[PDB]
Amino acid sequence: CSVDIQGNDQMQFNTNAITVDKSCKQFTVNLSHPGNLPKNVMGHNWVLSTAADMQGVVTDGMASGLDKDYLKPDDSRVIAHTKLIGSGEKDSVTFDVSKLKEGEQYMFFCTFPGHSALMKGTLTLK
């Protein structure tokens, strides 16, 4: 596995490169959030996808807007999204690891309006 990742008010993250073990049936991510800069001024998503899909889930996800969770509905290009948290929250995602092959490249990110540039990392498997 579990990671404990957290973003600031800088538009950053920490763990801009994850590694999930194969000797582990599921994976869980926990997002937290640090200063008082609300979920309309700095919210952070932790969405996962492959570095060939991101443009979908960033773009289509900024289309959706706030309420939709800056990440559209269904998106079968996401294997894991937490939700848009903000200052003082925490949330979590407990996904399968079936859902990921090995020898694929997966990037993670925050679909809020422009933080998918400084907030990206990688998820390789194992």
Looking at residues 85 to 114 of the shown chain, list those that interact with Cu ion (rule: CB under 5 A). 110, 112
Cβ-based nearer residue to Cu ion, 81 or 115: 115
81 lies in the binding site for Cu ion (CB under 5 A): no
Q: Which two tokens stand for residue 115?
A: 């933080």
Ordered DSSP codes for 54-81 = HHHHHHHHHHH-HHHHSS-SS-TT-SB-
Residues 36-65 vs Cu ion: string with x where CB under 5 A?
A: --------x---------------------
Give the whole-angstrom CA distance, residue 29 versus residue 14: 13
Cβ-based nearer residue to Cu ion, 34 or 56: 34
Q: Which residue has the tokens 């800056």?
A: 70
Q: Which residues bind Cu ion (CB under 5 A)?
A: 44, 110, 112, 115
